[PDB]
Write a protein that binds this ligand. Structure first.
Ligand SMILES: O=C(O)C1=C[C@H](O)[C@@H](OS(=O)(=O)O)[C@H](O[C@H]2[C@H](O)[C@@H](NS(=O)(=O)O)[C@@H](O)O[C@@H]2COS(=O)(=O)O)O1
Ligand SMILES: O=C(O)C1=C[C@H](O)[C@@H](OS(=O)(=O)O)[C@H](O[C@H]2[C@H](O)[C@@H](NS(=O)(=O)O)[C@@H](O)O[C@@H]2COS(=O)(=O)O)O1
Ligand SMILES: [Ca+2]
Length: 373
C-alpha cells in the first residue's frame, strides 16, 4: 500500500507476569509484545493490510532462539503479542505493596484485562497470512491460549500441597529461591574478594543454592495451540486436571503420530490433536480467518475431578480462486481443554519456535477479537 512507511519495528517488550506495561509499550491499544527484541522480530506491516489496517509481520531468523529448551543444550525462540497484561492504571489508587507483592508472586497480569474465567464459553477470531516462502518443516505455534497457573499454590518439602495467600508466599520467598517451579535455598552472592554483592538498591544479590524441597506451580502445555510441525498444520488441545501441575508428566500428543480426536492420556493429563492437515494443503499467500469457539472444561479444584468436559469448534475461512470458502475443520467436538487453576486463559499470537528448531520462520497475523457466548 503506502511506501512513506512500510515495515515499522515494534521493539518494546513486557514481562506480563512481573511488570505492568507502560503507555508507550502498548500496541494498538490492546497488545504488549513478549520475546526477543530484535527489530525484525515484530513489525507493523503497511504493505499487507487486513481489514483496512496494517498487519503484524513476525520473523525469527535461524539465530533467533534466545531461550533454553526443556532439555540441556536445547533452545527455543519467541516473538509474540499477548492480549493479557496489566497497566499502571490497574494499580492506581491501591497501596503500593499490592503491585510490589504482585511482582514477587508473578501475578501482575491478574490485575489486567485479557483473560477469560475458568469454565467460561468464549468466541475468538484471528487471521494469519502464510507466505509461499515459509519452509514446510518449520516447528512453530502461531496462536495459543495460555494458562494462568496458581502462583501461590505450593508443595511443602513433606509432599503436602497448600494454597498460600499472597502474603504467605511472599514470606516463603524470603528464604526460597524459585527457579521456575523448583525451590532452592537462597544464597547471598559474594565477589572474588569474598564481600557480599549488592543490587541497585543495596540489597544482597541472591543465587540458587541446593533444592530445598519446595515447589510452586509454574509452566505447563498451552490448553490450545495452532501450529506447524513435522510438515503438518495442526490444532492441539491440552487438559490438566491435577490441582498442582506436574511438569514431569510429559503427556503431549505428536501431531503426526496421534490420530485426530483420540486423546493421549496420563492420570491427570489429556492431549488431543483436534485437526491436522498436510502443510502443502494449507492455503498460501492469502488471509485465513479462524473462528474458534471454546467451552472451557470445568475442573474440581482440590478434588481434581472433571466436573464438566469442554468443547471446541473451529471454522477456517479464506478466498480460493476468487470465491469465499469456509471449512468446519473442528465440528463441535466434546473435548478436555484447560487447566485446573483458579484463573482462566489468555490469547497470544506470533511465533513460538519449539522442538529445538532453528528453521527460519516468517508470517503475518491480524484481526483478533473475542466475544462472550
Ligand atoms: O523458558 C521459558 O519458557 C521463558 C523464559 C523467560 O523467562 C520468559 O520468556 S520471555 O523472556 O520471552 O518473556 C518466560 O518466562 C516466564 C514463563 O514463560 C512463565 N510460564 S507460566 O508459569 O506458564 O506462565 C512463568 O514461569 O513466568 C516466567 C517469567 O517469570 S519472571 O521472569 O519472574 O517474570 O518464558
Ligand atoms: O519436550 C516437550 O514436552 C515438548 C517439546 C516441543 O517443543 C513441543 O512439542 S511439540 O513439538 O509437539 O510442539 C512442546 O513444547 C512444550 C514445552 O515442552 C512446555 N514446557 S513446560 O511448560 O515445562 O511443560 C511448554 O512450554 O509448552 C510447549 C508447547 O506445548 S504444546 O504446545 O503442547 O506442544 O512439548
Ligand atoms: Ca493448578
Amino acid at each position: 500500500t503506502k511506501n512513506t512507511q512500510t515495515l515499522m519495528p515494534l521493539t518494546e517488550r513486557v514481562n506480563v507476569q512481573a511488570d505492568s506495561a507502560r503507555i508507550n509499550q502498548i500496541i494498538d491499544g490492546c497488545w504488549v509484545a513478549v520475546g526477543t527484541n530484535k527489530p525484525h522480530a515484530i513489525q507493523r506491516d503497511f504493505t499487507n493490510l487486513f481489514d483496512g489496517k496494517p498487519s503484524y509481520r513476525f520473523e525469527l531468523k535461524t539465530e533467533d532462539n534466545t531461550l533454553e529448551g526443556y532439555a540441556k543444550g536445547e533452545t527455543k525462540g519467541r516473538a509474540e503479542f499477548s492480549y493479557c497484561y496489566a497497566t499502571s492504571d490497574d494499580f492506581k489508587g491501591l497501596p503500593a505493596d499490592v503491585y510490589q507483592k504482585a511482582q514477587i508472586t508473578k501475578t501482575v497480569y491478574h490485575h489486567g484485562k485479557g483473560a477469560c474465567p475458568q469454565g467460561s464459553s468464549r468466541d475468538y477470531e484471528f487471521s494469519v497470512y502464510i507466505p509461499s516462502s515459509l519452509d514446510s518443516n518449520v516447528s512453530t505455534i502461531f496462536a495459543q491460549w495460555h494458562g494462568m497457573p496458581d502462583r501461590t499454590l505450593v508443595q511443602t518439602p513433606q509432599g503436602e500441597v497448600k494454597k498460600l495467600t499472597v502474603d504467605e508466599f511472599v514470606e516463603l520467598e524470603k528464604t526460597t529461591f524459585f527457579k521456575k517451579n523448583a525451590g532452592h535455598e537462597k544464597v547471598v552472592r559474594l565477589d572474588k574478594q569474598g564481600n557480599p554483592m549488592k543490587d541497585k538498591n543495596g540489597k544482597p544479590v541472591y543465587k540458587a543454592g541446593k533444592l530445598n524441597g519446595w515447589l510452586v506451580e509454574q509452566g505447563g502445555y498451552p490448553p490450545l495451540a495452532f501450529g506447524f510441525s513435522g510438515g503438518l498444520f495442526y490444532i492441539k488441545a491440552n487438559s490438566d486436571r491435577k490441582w498442582l501441575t506436574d511438569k514431569d508428566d510429559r503427556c503431549n500428543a505428536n501431531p503426526g503420530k496421534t490420530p485426530v480426536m483420540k486423546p493421549l492420556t496420563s492420570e491427570y493429563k489429556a492431549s488431543t490433536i483436534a485437526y491436522k492437515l498436510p502443510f502443502a494443503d494449507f492455503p498460501k499467500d492469502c488471509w485465513i480467518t479462524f473462528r474458534v469457539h471454546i467451552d472451557w472444561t470445568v475442573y474440581g479444584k482440590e478434588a481434581e475431578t472433571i466436573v464438566k468436559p469442554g468443547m471446541l469448534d473451529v471454522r477456517m475461512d479464506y478466498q480460493e480462486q476468487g470465491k469465499k470458502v469456509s471449512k468446519h475443520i473442528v465440528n463441535n467436538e466434546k473435548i478436555l481443554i484447560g487447566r485446573n487453576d483458579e484463573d482462566g486463559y489468555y490469547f497470544k499470537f506470533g511465533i513460538y519456535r519449539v522442538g529445538d528448531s532453528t528453521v527460519p520462520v516468517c508470517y503475518n497475523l491480524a484481526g483478533y477479537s473475542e466475544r462472550l457466548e
